[PDB]
Design a protein around this ligand. Sequence first.
Ligand SMILES: OC[C@H]1O[C@H](O)[C@@H](O)[C@@H](O)[C@@H]1O
Length: 141
Amino acid sequence: SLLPVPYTEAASLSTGSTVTIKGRPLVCFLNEPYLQVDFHTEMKEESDIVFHFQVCFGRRVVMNSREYGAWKQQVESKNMPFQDGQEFELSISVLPDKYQVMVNGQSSYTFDHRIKPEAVKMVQVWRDISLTKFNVSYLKR
Ligand SMILES: OC[C@H]1O[C@H](O)[C@@H](O)[C@@H](O)[C@@H]1O
């Protein structure tokens, strides 16, 4: 809807930064829609990924990083706070030791930094969703 998907935005992250994403799945969970959020080191899609967050609605969540063109140790979670056919609010906060992911205001996943957050230069949100809001908090030094 509001914003185009794939959605790409140049960004700068550091401790205290928050990325808020608002959207909804394009189809019911039965058809297994996906949602993917990648924090890139460069403005290009082929660049490395500091934090890869992929949701298979109703199934699982996978997190990883792509370093020097290679995927690393994948982390899998079965925690599924997302609701079928519902708008969701996803917020990713940058803590000193890791990323904390909140879904609709509830802590749901964390991922220890593998690469310093300062290496991020772009964020891309894509797959099967309509995007209504994308915001990066630049209120701290
Ligand atoms: O999430 C999908 C993507 O990240 C995983 O963590 C890795 O195993 C990659 O091989 C895979 O292509």
